[PDB]
Amino acid sequence: KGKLPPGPTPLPFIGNYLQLNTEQMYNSLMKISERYGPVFTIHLGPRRVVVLCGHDAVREALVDQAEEFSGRGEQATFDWVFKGYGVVFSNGERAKQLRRFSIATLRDFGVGKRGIEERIQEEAGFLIDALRGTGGANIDPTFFLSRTVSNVISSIVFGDRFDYKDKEFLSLLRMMLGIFQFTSTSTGQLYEMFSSVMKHLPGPQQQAFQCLQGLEDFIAKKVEHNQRTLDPNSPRDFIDSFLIRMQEEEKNPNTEFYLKNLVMTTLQLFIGGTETVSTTLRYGFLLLMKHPEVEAKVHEEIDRVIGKNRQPKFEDRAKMPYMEAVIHEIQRFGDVIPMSLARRVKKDTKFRDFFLPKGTEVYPMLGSVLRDPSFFSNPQDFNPQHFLNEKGQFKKSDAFVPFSIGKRNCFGEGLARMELFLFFTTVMQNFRLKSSQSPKDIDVSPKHVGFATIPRNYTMSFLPR
C-alpha cells in the first residue's frame, strides 16, 4: 500500500499532544494501539514517530530489518548536552567509528573476562562491608547500591574506583538519579515534545541541564588531568586509550576522534553503566521483600551451590537456574527503559506493507515486549516461573529484551549481567531482607514511567544470615 502507518490526526505543532498523557506515555501509546494496531504513527509535538508494540513487531524491525532500523533517534533532554556527539546519540560514520572503538576498549580493560570479574567481586566485597556497616538499621539503599555499581564502570574509564565517602562522588550520583527521574516525570516527557521552546524557559528542565552540565564539567576535568599525565604506550583507562587514538588521528581532518566525542562518550558510559544497573538492583530488592517465598528459594540455591564462605563467581550461574530466572524476572518486571532509546530509519523502508521514509523516528516499546501476553502467562505479576520450565530449569524467552535487540543494541549488556548476578547473589548470600512494612502492603508499582521506570522510595534493613 506504500504508505506511512495510521494514527490519531495531529494538529499543527502540538501534534497528538491532546490524545496523550505526559505522566503516562506508555499507557497512552498502548491505548492508541488498541485502536490502530501494534504499529502506528504518533506525533510528539513536531516529532513524527512510528511506534512498535509487542514482540513480533519489534523483532521484525530491529532484527529482521536491522540495518534499516539501525539509525539512532533522539531523546531531547540528553541531546541538550550531547548534541549528537558521543557513541550513544551519534549516527552514521561517527557512530560506526565510536561504537567499534568502545567495545574493543572495553574488552581490553577486562569486560567479559577475569579482570572485570575480579573487579566486580572486589566491589561486591565493599558493598557487603558497607551493608554490615549499617548494623541492621533500616536505611535507604539507593546510594549504597549506585556507589557500588558506579565504581565498576568508573574503574574502566577513570582508571580507579571512588571512595564511598567521597562527597563529590555522592554529588555525581545525585545528578544521575535526578536526571533519570526527571526524564520519567510528565514534564520530562512534555519536554520530549516541546524542547524547541521549553529549553529556553524556566522550570524543572533547567535543573536537569544543570545536572548534565555538572557531569560534563566533571568529565572535562578528568580528561584534562589524564591529558597531562599521559603515557602514550601505557594507557591507564578508557580515556587514555581514546587520547592515544586522538594523537594518532591528528593529521586526519575527517577523524571522529576528537575531544568532544571523548568527553561525551565517557559521560555516556558513566551515566549508562550506572543508573540503569542501580535502578534494576533497587527494584529487585523491593520485589524480593514483597515475595518472601522467592527470597527463600534463592537462599536454598545459594547455600547449596556456593555455601557461606567463598565469594560467588560468575560461572556459578550455570548451576543456579532459579537465581537466573529471578534476575530475568526482575529485569522483565522492572522494565527499566520502557521505550528503549529511539531508533530512526537509515533509509526509505517498506515494513509490513507500510512506508517509512528516511529519517523517521522509531519507538521500540520494549515494555510491550517484556509483557507480551503471548510469551508470558501472567505478565502483570512478579513470577520467576516465567523463566523456568516444569523441572525448574532455566527457560529463555524471545520476548526478553531489556537490553533491546538489533544493530544499536546495548553493548554494555555483558558487564550489566555479570554485575547483576554478582551483586544480587553476593548480597543474598550474606543477608536476608527485612522490609519496613508487611509484604502484602508493599507497593511494587512504579513512581514514574517515562524514559525510565522508577520504583517507589523505600527503606529496608539487611540482617546478617
184 contributes a contact to ligand HEM by CB under 6 A? no
Under a CB-based contact definition with an 8 Å cutoff, are residues 304 and 125 in contact?
Answer: no
Identify residues 219-258 at the interface with ligand HEM (CB under 6 A): none
Binder among 7, 38, 235, 272 for ligand HEM (CB under 6 A): 272
- Which residue, 71 or 235, is less far from ligand HEM as judged by CB? 71
Q: How far is it, in rounded angstroms, from Cα 280 to Cα 268?
A: 18
Identify the CA nearest to 48 among candidates 347, 338, 363. 363
Shortest distance, position 105 Cβ to ligand HEM, whole Å: 11
Closest separation in Å from C-beta 209 to ligand HEM: 21
∠ CA 418-116-166, rounded to 5°? 95
Q: Beta strand 47-53 with 39-44: parallel, antiparallel or unpaired?
A: antiparallel
Q: The C-alpha cell of 251 is what?
A: 593529521
- Cell numbers at residue 347, please? 533509509
C-alpha cell at 248: 594518532
Supply 58's cell numbers: 519489534
> Which one, 105 or 461, has the nearer CB to ligand HEM?
105
If 0-12 CB within 10 Å is exposed, 13-18 middle and 19+ buried, where does residue 399 land?
Answer: buried
Helix, strand or coil for residue 82?
Answer: helix
Please report whether residue 269 would count as binding ligand HEM according to CB under 6 A: yes
Nearer to ligand HEM (CB atom), residue 84 or residue 125: 84
Q: Which stretch binds ligand HEM (CB under 6 A): 30-38, 196-204, 233-241, 266-274?
A: 266-274
The residue (of 222 and 432) whose beta carbon lies closer to ligand HEM is 222
Q: Shortest distance, CB of residue 114 to ligand HEM, whole angstroms?
A: 18
Taking the least distance from each CB to ligand HEM, the nearer of 188 and 272 is 272
Strand partners, 463: 432
Tell me which long-range contacts 11-18 makes (C-beta under 8 A, separation of at least 24): 13/45, 13/46, 14/45, 14/193, 15/42, 15/43, 15/44, 15/45, 15/46, 15/47, 15/193, 16/42, 16/43, 16/44, 17/45, 17/193
Nearest residue relative to ligand HEM (C-beta): 412
SS3 content of the chain, % helix, strand, coil (to 5): 50, 10, 35
Q: How many CA atoms lie within 13 A of 318 on its CB side?
A: 2
SS3 88: coil
CB of 299 to ligand HEM, least distance (A): 23
Contact region with ligand HEM (CB under 6 A), list: 20-28, 45-53, 267-275, 435-443: 267-275
Instruction: Report the C-alpha dihedral over residues 399, 401, 404, 407, rounded to 10 degrees.
Output: -70
* Helices assigned H by DSSP within 230-314: 238-248, 259-290, 292-305
What would the x/- binding string for ligand HEM be over residues 336 to 365, using CB under 6 A?
Answer: xx--xx-x----------------------
Q: Which residues, at least 6 apart from 192, have a Cβ–Cβ distance to it below 8 Å?
A: 44, 45, 47, 75, 76, 77, 451
Q: Which of 75, 205, 276, 349 binds ligand HEM (CB under 6 A)?
A: 276
**Interaction of residue 454 with ligand HEM, rule CB under 6 A:** no
- Is the CB of 69 or the CB of 143 nearer to ligand HEM? 69
Of 119 and 408, CB closest to ligand HEM: 408
Question: Between 316 and 419, whose beta carbon lies closer to ligand HEM?
Answer: 419
Cell (9 digits) for 355: 512506508
Min CB(335)–ligand HEM separation in Å? 9
Q: Looking at 168-176, 309-317, 335-343, 374-382, which segment touches ligand HEM (CB under 6 A)?
A: 335-343
Compute the least distance from the CB of residue 13 to ligand HEM, in Å. 28
Query: Can you tell me which of 52, 76, 127, 153 binds ligand HEM, judged by CB under 6 A?
Result: 153
Tell me, by CB under 6 A, how many residues bind ligand HEM.
28
| Residues 8-47: x where in contact with ligand HEM by CB under 6 A, - otherwise, as a string | ----------------------------------------
Mark 74-113 with x for binding to ligand HEM (rule: CB under 6 A) and - for no binding. -------------xx----------x--------------
| Region 382-441 residues binding ligand HEM, contact defined as CB under 6 A | 402-404, 406, 408-412, 415-416
Task: Pick the closest to residue 28 from 36, 38, 20 (CA basis).
Answer: 20
Angle 448-207-447 from CA coordinates, rounded to 5° = 10
Which residue's CB is nearer to ligand HEM, number 43 or number 343? Answer: 343
Look at residue 197 and give its three-state secondary structure: helix
Cα Rg, the chain, nearest whole Å: 22
Instruction: Answer whether 404's CB lies under 8 Å from 366's CB.
Output: yes
Binding positions for ligand HEM, 277-316, rule CB under 6 A: 277, 280
Q: 47-53 and 361-365: which strand pairing?
A: parallel
Binding site for ligand HEM (CB under 6 A): 72, 87-88, 99, 153, 268-269, 272-273, 276-277, 280, 336-337, 340-341, 343, 402-404, 406, 408-412, 415-416
